Amino acid sequence: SSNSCTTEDRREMQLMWANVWSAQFTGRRLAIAQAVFKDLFAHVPDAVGLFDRVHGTEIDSSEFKAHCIRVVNGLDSAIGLLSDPSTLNEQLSHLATQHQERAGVTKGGFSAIAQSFLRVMPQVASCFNPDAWSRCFNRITNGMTEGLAE
Amino acid sequence: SSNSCTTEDRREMQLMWANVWSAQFTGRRLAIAQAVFKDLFAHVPDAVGLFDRVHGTEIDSSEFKAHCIRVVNGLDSAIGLLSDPSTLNEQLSHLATQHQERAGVTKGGFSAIAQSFLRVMPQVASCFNPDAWSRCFNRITNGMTEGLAE
Amino acid sequence: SEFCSEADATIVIKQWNQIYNAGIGAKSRWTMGNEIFSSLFKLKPESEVLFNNVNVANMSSGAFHAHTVRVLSGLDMGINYLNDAGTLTSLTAHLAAQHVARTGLKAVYFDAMGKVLMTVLPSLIDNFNPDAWRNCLLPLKNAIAKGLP
Amino acid sequence: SEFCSEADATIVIKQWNQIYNAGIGAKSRWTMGNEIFSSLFKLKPESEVLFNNVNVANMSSGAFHAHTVRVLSGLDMGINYLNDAGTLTSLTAHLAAQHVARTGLKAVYFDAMGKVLMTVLPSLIDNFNPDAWRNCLLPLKNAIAKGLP
Amino acid sequence: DCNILQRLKVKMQWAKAYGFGTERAKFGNSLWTSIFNYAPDARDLFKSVKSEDMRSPQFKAHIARVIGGLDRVISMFDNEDALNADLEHLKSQHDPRGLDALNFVVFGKALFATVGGQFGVCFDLPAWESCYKVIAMGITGNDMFS
Amino acid sequence: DCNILQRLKVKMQWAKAYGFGTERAKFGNSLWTSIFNYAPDARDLFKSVKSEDMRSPQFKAHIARVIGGLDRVISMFDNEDALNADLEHLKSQHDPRGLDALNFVVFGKALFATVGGQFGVCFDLPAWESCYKVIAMGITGNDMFS
Amino acid sequence: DCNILQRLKVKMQWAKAYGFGTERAKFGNSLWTSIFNYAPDARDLFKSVKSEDMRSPQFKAHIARVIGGLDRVISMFDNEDALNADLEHLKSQHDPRGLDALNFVVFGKALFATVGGQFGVCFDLPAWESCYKVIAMGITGNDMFS
Amino acid sequence: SECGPLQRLKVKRQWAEAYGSGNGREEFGHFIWANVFKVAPSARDMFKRVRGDNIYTPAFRAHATRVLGGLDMCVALLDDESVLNTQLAHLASQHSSRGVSAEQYNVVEHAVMMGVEHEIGQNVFDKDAWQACLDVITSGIQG
Amino acid sequence: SECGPLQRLKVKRQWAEAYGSGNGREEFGHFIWANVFKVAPSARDMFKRVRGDNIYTPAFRAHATRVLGGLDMCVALLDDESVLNTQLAHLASQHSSRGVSAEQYNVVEHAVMMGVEHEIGQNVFDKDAWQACLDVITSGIQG
Amino acid sequence: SECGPLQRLKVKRQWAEAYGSGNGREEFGHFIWANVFKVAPSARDMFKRVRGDNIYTPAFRAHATRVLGGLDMCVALLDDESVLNTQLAHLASQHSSRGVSAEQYNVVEHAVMMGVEHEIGQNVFDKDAWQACLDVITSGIQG
């Protein structure tokens, strides 16, 4: 189809996300956060080498735990900013100009983290729609993937 | 029964009280205020001796008139504070620690003022419930009667 | 027979469910267990000796953790049943027998337990209502602590 | 076949009607025509030469004024028909034929036209939604600019 | 006729009656239904837009372009320069077809009945008749709209 | 099985389906109705709670304690130490009764049908089946829940 | 298992939960959404049906034929000969694909979660378990559904 | 300007309305004190006993109840100077020990007028009648 | 006073409520920054890059999203000091280069508490628990 | 920055919306003047004739009607500089006798922008377009 992130998916994605991700329920974040990078490291072997600063080799290290929550909290902002696309565009350019200075960050890396999210979400979130999720997940990543290599 | 001041009585007591007691209708307070102490002095003969400072002997004296309105205005606060019991508890301790320094203030005195209120209210307030009134009137007095003698 | 009015019971159940439901992370359930029992043992140091089986010497143990949940689950059960007087009477009678049959437990322990909850909960619940809780809890306390010395 | 979702189309039509309806004074319609075309000719100075018939050498002329309204009326027509995919497909096919048959018009012109609108409109519409517009406009652009070099 | 006050009144009555979105398609539908009911023979002058079936997207597109241009002409009622510049443009587009000028008469009668019934009782018919002559004269050029 | 994501999903689906207050009593009522409808012979194993009449406050109290403990076990799904410590505690309470382990099978089937019908279509049956084995294995200890 | 009593209740629980008209298409969508959520690898097993887009008319056509095949097999639960005839015809259609029979286990989990979540709390999970194995065995030919 | 008998009557009805029946009084009390301590943050130092550090404490909300109830009495008796002078002189004795600054009365004066107008509405508020009559109440407490 | 474990729990639930689910976050973000730049108009000079001149710009609304999201992480981990110290030390490195004044933290501290209480309500707000716990968050970013 | 033709168009529609149709104009007028005299209490001294002492007086509410209506004219003609310069020069003659300070224009500038954004909402308000265009209006009245 059009593959565009519709307003319908925005409502659908935000609503299923806001119930699973909230500020009062600590650990619910961290379990989701740790599982995504865990799925990424298995599929992408030469990816842990990109997260040595946060000690990506040691997943339960408090430094990689903090990074995990930082990554998907930024995702929570983007999903929340789906309602206000102007602020979202100005923010997506920030993450885009933030990630390419990290050498090794590639479009395929964001493509592998997409399959990482397509598998993890239905196990923790009920009424998960993969099509609606991906079409807006792609919409976000391509704004983060403005200036970098495939 | 349980004898506890229910939320039902709180609504019932506040609603019948707010209609009879208001800030715009002066004299409506004073008539109710003067009648309660008047009923108390007849039943308790050695009680006027406790209100000599406010000239309790002379009931229509402007000094005893001011005291009358002060007493039942504080009652109006307690009835209004029935909705917020936390603030009510912190306030009931204030009146409790305020009244025992007046020597002669006893639990029986607050028991006589209870019968004083059970007779006066139905004459001025329509739809007056004595059971609901007393159960919350008792709830208030026992917070004022924390540290004093029977 | 009767515990507290529906309106009072409605206030208790709603404010209790705000801070205690199933979807809460276990870490928040442990903060509640220790804070309440550490305060209880400060009011009654003689009562700390009694929880030998649940490894009370180390409150950070999973055995004592699981014990505090049993107590809170039983408390959560009683609060959500405040509107059914028939079931609650049978429920309170069954918890009494368990605590009376256990040796070394006084009635003053449960009363001190009441003052801990009346002090612990205000720092967790928004607009805590001491009256409605005092109207609905003290029937439970006396019914659970019935028959104990 | 399909252009954009109803919810996205609903967002576009409402925000478009806010700044463009019939009851607007002609002076506000001229401010829009020049600002959009002056910005278009700044992105593409080679495209200015093409509007010879409408007296593009003088944008303050009634002939060029009437031309900008024709373009906006056609744009206003397409936006209000975003919910009818059948009519919109026939409408977009008819505007393509008119522009393809005209000599000297490229596809990059319409793309630069897209970036002008995406930049001009935010300063006129309250809470402009770039996504919903990008979801509903780029189907129109590609459908109108279909078949052009 | 067709002074500035009538021009502004026509715009307010047109903008209200025209609507936006789904209402525009239903508005222009009733007008051409009146045209085909007032002048039944004028239907076959639009065989190029598949006017055999009014529900066809080819005729729905023709409705959209016609009333859309009527919307853009009414919007330029206040300014004469671009109005006449567009009326002349529409003239050089319709003149090659060589149409009967009596259809623009039937066009106005259908427009008045469609705008009047949609706007309500406060429909200013004399103002709409006077300002419609300006439009038909700019397109047809026929002296019929003096 | 029964990973952390399933454990967290089970808690969210349990907390929603369980409800609070009057809903809990009606929830546990339908579960034991299913148990007595799935396994009719298991009803007379509860003569000590007056299970002759399900409306009796003795059986309503039994319902409350059972599902209440199930609520407290599900709440400790994330933490293993207190989960196993409570599963062992429930084991040492149920083992003296010496119950058939096939009833815990019927217990899960009734729980799945009760939570599933109350939660709706988005009920994650494989996650609930996998994490129920952890509970029954902790209580029964029977190899039946491998 | 799957006695005639369980066969008849499944039909009643199925006809109610399946619905008619628009309910059929939405029911299958909820089921196939649960399948791909349970087993993401299975979505690729339908590349020749446009499983990349679940709202595609080719997958909506596939969803229709699957829920229709289920609807007609459940309806023949009471006649062995016709059931086992069509069930083996469905085997002759699914065997040339060489599908992993574990996917049919995932198909059952979503079916129970979709009927139960729609039928409500009274959903008979054990009866649906016993009778789906009859359908699975006749299609898969696998000893796992014995 | 002056708190005449008519300006008294309008103030009474507006206070009763703004005060309420006990439902919005906690909000009414909190709203007024937040203005005082925003305009005069050093006034917090005078209310140490009621925990003037935190407006949201029930102990301070009890103090807000005290001052609101005391102010309600003076408004109720603005028409009757005989007993009003008695009530203001009674409040004058308790407030003289605090050594309250005269400007501090004008801050709570202004804050109460902001609180009232916030409850009733600016379209019906009467600043002239309220300023003149609130000066009378504070003057009696000061002497 | 002190940010105990109970004061942590109440702050978490109140922040989640005040933060919302993304619908009132733009309003939540704009409301807090308007207090800071009203109380401290010279703080605008520190946010030149995000266009601190104008609060209503999507570029600044993105910065408000950044600081709100970063603050949401610390509140979510107030119970878990191990990873919390990691997150505050991480924020400490980025904010040390700005040379932010210690008083400037107390202004955004107060503004956030105004923002939260504006979203949840004064009747449920806990200043003592919030002031004690927000001091912990800012202290880690300062060192 | 600059009051371009597009920034004019957006200001016009937002002013018409914020101004209303006469129902919320008394509230619109009162709201703006309360900001000025809170930020600049000494500006009350310039409006003695309209009873600047009390915002709630119909005589001052008539003055608020005067300044609001006069400001509505300039906004309506921001697109047409020829007649706009005539209107601003007309207002310039009357305001030169008052000796109004240039900063006093910037206070009512800011207050009007607060009034507008209070009526329409921060999510739709455009400070850049409003500040640039309100500078144009005040500059013509000053010279």
Ligand code: HEM
């Ligand atoms: C679309 C999902 C993603 C989001 C929302 C996201 C967000 C973030 C955030 C918020 C940070 C930390 C910013 C800060 O420290 O202030 C970060 C850091 C980083 N990200 Fe991502 N990220 C995503 C995907 C990825 C992917 C697929 C890669 C692939 C390599 C990647 C590579 C990195 C690296 C190398 C860092 C720096 C780690 C460090 O500071 O030690 N990110 N990301």
Ligand code: HEM
């Ligand atoms: C429950 C109903 C009562 C309420 C609400 C109440 C309230 C009050 C109030 C507000 C005051 C004045 C506080 C002040 O001056 O700041 C007061 C004074 C006093 N009350 Fe009560 N009171 C009640 C019942 C009683 C009873 C039954 C007695 C029995 C002796 C009593 C004895 C006194 C005395 C001796 C004073 C001091 C009079 C003075 O200052 O000259 N009160 N009370």
Ligand code: HEM
């Ligand atoms: C409202 C207050 C209380 C409630 C609802 C409550 C409830 C419970 C529950 C549900 C159990 C678990 C029973 C089981 O294992 O099946 C329990 C056990 C126990 N309780 Fe309480 N309890 C309360 C207060 C107290 C107090 C105040 C004390 C002592 C001072 C106490 C002493 C014990 C002991 C010693 C056990 C058994 C420990 C073990 O099995 O190792 N309880 N209580």
Ligand code: HEM
């Ligand atoms: C969404 C974008 C556009 C729309 C909806 C649109 C629509 C229109 C319309 C309605 C007309 C009048 C047709 C008639 O006279 O019957 C027109 C004419 C024309 N357009 Fe476009 N247009 C667009 C963009 C462009 C662009 C980007 C260019 C060139 C760079 C262009 C070049 C022309 C030319 C040369 C004419 C004819 C001028 C004349 O007749 O003298 N258009 N367009």
Ligand code: HEM
């Ligand atoms: C105010 C009155 C009218 C206006 C504004 C108007 C406008 C238009 C427009 C905008 C088009 C299409 C231009 C394009 O294709 O780019 C058109 C075409 C056409 N019009 Fe009119 N029209 C009006 C009245 C009439 C009348 C009274 C007739 C009488 C029969 C008529 C007959 C036609 C025909 C036959 C076409 C050709 C359509 C095609 O084959 O594509 N119009 N007109």
Ligand code: HEM
């Ligand atoms: C997850 C599953 C289960 C849980 C969490 C559970 C929990 C409980 C609890 C909390 C009690 C009462 C403890 C007390 O009196 O303090 C109890 C008692 C009992 N349970 Fe279970 N139970 C479960 C499953 C079963 C099953 C499958 C059976 C099979 C028959 C069963 C049979 C009984 C019996 C006979 C009693 C004795 C009740 C009495 O006489 O007071 N339970 N269980």
Ligand code: HEM
């Ligand atoms: C009771 C369970 C099922 C029934 C009744 C069923 C029924 C059907 C039907 C009616 C068709 C289409 C027949 C036709 O084209 O005329 C079909 C096709 C197909 N089935 Fe199933 N199905 C079931 C489960 C499954 C499962 C679990 C899988 C594998 C995960 C599967 C894989 C396929 C595939 C790959 C096709 C080919 C569709 C195409 O390319 O047109 N089916 N099935």
Ligand code: HEM
């Ligand atoms: C409108 C005039 C005022 C009224 C009606 C009023 C009312 C009251 C009342 C009823 C009390 C309770 C006294 C007691 O029960 O012992 C009180 C206490 C107090 N008031 Fe006021 N007050 C007013 C003005 C002020 C002002 C303007 C200040 C200082 C700025 C002030 C400072 C205090 C202090 C320091 C206390 C005692 C604090 C404490 O108990 O810890 N009062 N006020």
Ligand code: HEM
């Ligand atoms: C509660 C404590 C604070 C938190 C959680 C916080 C959060 C943040 C975050 C997440 C960023 C984004 C940094 C980046 O992506 O590069 C940031 C930027 C910044 N913060 Fe803060 N902040 C806090 C306090 C402050 C304070 C009190 C000030 C000064 C008064 C301040 C000044 C700045 C500056 C100057 C920047 C960079 C501005 C720019 O990017 O142009 N921060 N803050």
Ligand code: HEM
């Ligand atoms: C945005 C710019 C302003 C506009 C549109 C405006 C509008 C008006 C209007 C229409 C009048 C009525 C004059 C008359 O009928 O005689 C007036 C009066 C007045 N304005 Fe303004 N004004 C503006 C700015 C200011 C400012 C900034 C000040 C001082 C801070 C000011 C001070 C006065 C004074 C002193 C009067 C006469 C007061 C009186 O009649 O007693 N004006 N203004």
Ligand SMILES: *[C@@H]1O[C@H](CO[C@@H]2O[C@@H](C)[C@@H](O)[C@@H](O)[C@@H]2O)[C@@H](O)[C@H](O)[C@H]1NC(C)=O
């Ligand atoms: C208290 O006990 C802690 C034990 O850790 C917990 O219990 C054991 C059985 C394991 O399950 C473990 O994973 C749990 O976290 C000790 O770590 C701690 O030092 C003890 N505290 C004192 C003061 O001795």
Ligand SMILES: *[C@@H]1O[C@H](CO[C@@H]2O[C@@H](C)[C@@H](O)[C@@H](O)[C@@H]2O)[C@@H](O)[C@H](O)[C@H]1NC(C)=O
């Ligand atoms: C641009 O053209 C203007 C012409 O005025 C307009 O066009 C003529 C045909 C009349 O209809 C008139 O009423 C219109 O307003 C000139 O006035 C202007 O100077 C020209 N600009 C330049 C730079 O040459």
Ligand SMILES: [Ca+2]
């Ligand atoms: Ca004064």
Ligand SMILES: [Ca+2]
């Ligand atoms: Ca601090």
Ligand SMILES: [Ca+2]
């Ligand atoms: Ca200026």
